[PDB]
């Protein structure tokens, strides 16, 4: 596994997450650890003016459900996503 470094430390009741899209747009986000896959696709796909159900968003190479648990998603501070290419941006 790769070193701990240390979190952020910024965070209490909320963690950090770094969005980055395939436009090469990165946006950081405050989330909860067992946030839904909604919380963050419906306020990305807002702030773009794109579809929700046309932004995908996967963690570590996985896709984000509202199901995920945060034991199975393991966010933390300022954490990393990514976004692959919305249906309607094209």
Same mark, same amino acid.
């Given at each position: ?6 979190? *952020?430390?910024?965070?209490?009741? &909320?963690?950090?997450?770094?969005? %980055?899209?395939?436009? /090469?747009?990165?946006?950081? @986000? ?7 896959? *909604?919380?963050?696709?419906?306020? &990305?796909?807002?702030?773009?003016? %794109?579809?929700?159900? /046309?932004?995908?968003?996967? @963690? ?19 954490? %990393? ?10």
């Amino acid at each position: 596994m790769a070193d701990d470094a240390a979190q *952020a430390g910024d965070n209490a009741e &909320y963690i950090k997450i770094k969005v %980055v899209g395939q436009d /090469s747009n990165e946006v950081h @986000f405050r989330v909860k650890y067992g946030t839904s896959m *909604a919380k963050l696709k419906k306020s &990305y796909a807002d702030r773009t003016g %794109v579809a929700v159900n /046309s932004l995908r968003f996967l @963690f570590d190479g996985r896709r984000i459900n509202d199901d995920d648990t945060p034991k199975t998603l393991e966010m933390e501070d300022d954490d %990393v996503i990514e976004v692959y290419q919305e249906q309607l941006g094209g």
